[PDB]
Amino acid sequence: NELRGLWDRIENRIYNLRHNLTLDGKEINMDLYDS
Amino acid sequence: IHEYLEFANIKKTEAEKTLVDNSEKCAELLAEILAWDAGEILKAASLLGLNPPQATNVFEIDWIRRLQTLSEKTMISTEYLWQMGDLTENSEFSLKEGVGEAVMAALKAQGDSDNV
Amino acid sequence: LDSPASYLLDLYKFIQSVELDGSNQARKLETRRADIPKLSLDNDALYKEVTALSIVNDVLSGSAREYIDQSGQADKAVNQILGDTHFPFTLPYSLPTQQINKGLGASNIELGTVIQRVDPQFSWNTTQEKYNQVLLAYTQLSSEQIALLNFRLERLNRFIRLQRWLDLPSHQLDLLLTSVMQADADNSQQEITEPVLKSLGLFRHLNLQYKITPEIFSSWLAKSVKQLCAGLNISAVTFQFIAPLVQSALGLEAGTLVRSFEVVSSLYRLVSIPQTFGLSTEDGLILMNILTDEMGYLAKQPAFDDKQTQDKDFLSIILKMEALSAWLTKNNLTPA
Amino acid sequence: AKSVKQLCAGLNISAVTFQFIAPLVQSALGLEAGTLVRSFEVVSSLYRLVSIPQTFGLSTEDGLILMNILTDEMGYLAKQPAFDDKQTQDKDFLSIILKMEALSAWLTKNNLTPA
Amino acid sequence: MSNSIEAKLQEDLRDALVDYYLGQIVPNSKDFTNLRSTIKNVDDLYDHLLLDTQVSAKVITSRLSLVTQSVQQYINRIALNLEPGLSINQQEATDWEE
Incomplete structure (x- = not known):
């Protein structure tokens, strides 16, 4: 079960790094408002 | 509106149709009552029997x-809105390839700002 | 002294002397993946070298587009040949001139293809070919590619695999298509053709405007306790109009106890369709009478093979109900 | 054809104004399609005609009014920047932008319009 | 503008990749076709071309970083596995420490 949890963890972390600008949070875009 | 419609109706067969109703000034008052463009409204000459057309x-x-x-x-433009009609009937493809690009360029001319 | 270049050259002059030869790919691939120690411009460009993902596109595509030139198959065609292939499940017609005509035309002010309903005619009380423009315009999501509708059988299942133009799951198309393919009396596999495909534009329309579900759409396309319990959706005092409905089959106010599908699907039509426009049953019966001189294919069948002979077709009726619901919202009149 | 670039010039101000651009290319040689060469003597005059009136908030149809009213002609829009015509004091371009400003102030002071 | 980005992605996400994969490898070449069995998935396109396809739609960086990354990945990759058939001497195999 550890192999299957491990390879899925690295796939999720690559997806996050491939977006970058989240850091799984929201670094770049925040507090903006309109109207 | 009455003086415009009464003028549009003057003697189409015996006088005005072969004189194009004096299109350069009769079609002007139809724009002026709307405060709108006297130019692109002349695209109406693409229908109704070589009249201005206005007497409808x-x-x-x-x-x-x-x-x-x-x-x-x-x-x-109303000129491009006509092409959006012509493209309906499994029509020639280069006109669709051009109209899609023309509408895209018309959006870039406004963008994420507002512009014109 | 040290630089981004002294870091890079300490790799480059090191990899050059990794000399082992013969049939092995490694240099063959690296030289096929061509770039050189003086790629472009000069090393001081670095601050302006800041660029998006767009830098990658010509490194893949700029060699790839040479295939028609290399094979000698074409040359005067500038790029578009990549929209004109199928068999490797190639996804043809994908060129942006098809997709922007759906997405970009919505993205500004939310107009879509519905613009074909607006012009140049004075009123929507107009001949059949107009509605056949607009309903097909609502189906689109794609292009003239829809003319395409062991391998000799799987190439027919590809018409469901090619649902990719639409955000539809694999359970949707059999639910969508089975009711209309049962309403059509024809026997052979040609039943996939465009006289059925027109129906998905009405689904897309009612989804975008009113958020219906494929189940309800494909469904509408003593026993006294059940006779009363039908009053859950709209109050059973309306069933003075339901004894006039069962005359499309055989029945009586008590004798309708059999609740046959040809009758209860017509109850499903009559209870569902007017409520999309906020109408009561007494207002819906007014629109049908005013527009058609009859029940407008409520109480009767869904017109599907009567539409094959252009007889007051049901697929036009919901458009007329919408067009009047707009005009009667614009003006402070009432159906009564 | 060059029609994509002929339309894409409409980014700054809507291409429906180009009914006035076939009258502009008469300072060189060209036609509504035949202007496809986009030569610097023509496109720098597009750059003048699109830039200078917008400093005062004018539309192209208002800018053409000021030039006609002040000069009886295009006021060195569509033509060259007057630089060696200014050496012989002929309606010089360096005065025109001052007149556009002076009228933009007076026409802001009063609730009239160019039209 | 924010919605035209969708089309500048879609031409590389799909069009440039599938027409390359089928056309170049199977019929056309004496380039990839000498190695016909080696590619079947985007993971092979990544490993063979040294390029980050189908990903990173919002990211910005220097061209020098991409150039570096390709060689930086390759000098890792030849030490990560012994295909293609090259080998690394024990000094060179010590000095990836640097």
């Missing part, structure tokens, strides 16, 4: 109400 005393005005509001939804 409501339907052209009724359509131009919707052309004026569409012309405020988007900056597209």
Whole structure:
């Protein structure tokens, strides 16, 4: 079960790094408002 | 509106049709009552039997109400809105390839800002 | 002294002397993946070298587009040949001139293809070919590619695999298509053709405007306790109009106890369709009478093979109900 | 054809104004399609005609009014930047932008319009 | 503008990748076709071309970083596995420490 949890963890972390600008949070875009 | 419609109706067969109703000034008052463009409204000459056309005393005005509001939804011409009709019937492809690009360019001219 | 270049050259002059030869790919691939120690411009460009993902596109595509030139198959065609292939499940017609005509035309002010309903005619009380423009314009999501509708059988299942133009799951198309393919009396596999495909534009329309579900759409396309319990959706005092409905089959106010599908699907039509426009049953019966001189294919069948002979077709009726619901919202009149 | 670039010039101000651009290319040689060469003597005059009136908030149809009213002609829009015509004091371009400003102030002071 | 980005992605996400994969490898070449069995998935396109396809739609960086990354990945990759058939001497195999 550890192999299957491990390879899925690295796939999720690559997806996050491939977006970058989240850091799984929201670094770049925040507090903006309109109207 | 009455003086415009009464003028549009003057003697089409015996006088005015072969004189194009003096299109350069009769079609001007139809724009002036709308405070709108006396130019692109002349595209109506693409239908109704080589008349201006104007003596169809409501339907052209009724359509131009919707052309004026569409012309405020988007900056597209009535000339291009005609192509969006012509493309319906499994028509020639280069006109669709061009119209899609022309509508894209008309959006870039507004962008994420507002512009014109 | 040290630089981004002294870091790079300490790799480059090191990899050059990794000399082992013969049939092995490594240099063959690296030289096929061509770039050189003086790629472009000069090393001081670095601050302006800041660029998006767009830098990658010509490194893949700029060699790839040479295939028609290399094979000698074409040359005057500038790029578009990549929209004109199928068999490797190639996804043809994908060129942006098709997709922007759906997405970009919505993205500004939310108009879509519905613009074909607006012009140049004075009123929507107009001949059949107009509705056949607009309903097909609502189906689109794609292009003239829809003319395409062991391998000799799987190439027919590809018409469901090619649902990719639409955000539809694999359970949707059989639910969508089975009711209309049962309403059509024809026997052979040609039943996939465009006289059925027109129906998905009405689904797309009612979804975008009113958020219906494929189940309800494909469904509408003593026993006294059940006779009363039908009053859950709209109050059973309306069933003075339901004894007039069962005359499309055989029945009586008590004798309708059999609740047959040809009758109860017509109850499903009559209870569902007017409520999309906020109408009561007494207002819906007014629109049908005013527009058609009859029940407008409520109480009767969904017109599907009567539409094959252009007889007051049901697919036009919901457009007329919408067009009047707009005009009767614009003006402070009432159906009564 | 060059029609994509002929339309894409409409980014700054809507291409429906180009009914006035076939009258502009008469300072060189060209036609509504035949202007496809986009030569610097023509496109720098597009750059003048699109830039200078917008400093005062004018539309192209208002800018053409000021030039006609002040000069009886295009006021060195569509033509060259007057630089060696200014050496012989002929309606010089360096005065025109001052007149556009002076009228933009007076026409802001009063609730009239160019039209 | 924010919605035209969708089309500048879609031409590389799909069009440039599938027409390359089928056309170049199977019929056309004496380039990839000498190695016909080696590619079947985007993971092979990544490993063979040294390029980050189908990903990173919002990211910005220097061209020098991409150039570096390709060689930086390759000098890792030849030490990560012994295909293609090259080998690394024990000094060179010590000095990836640097």
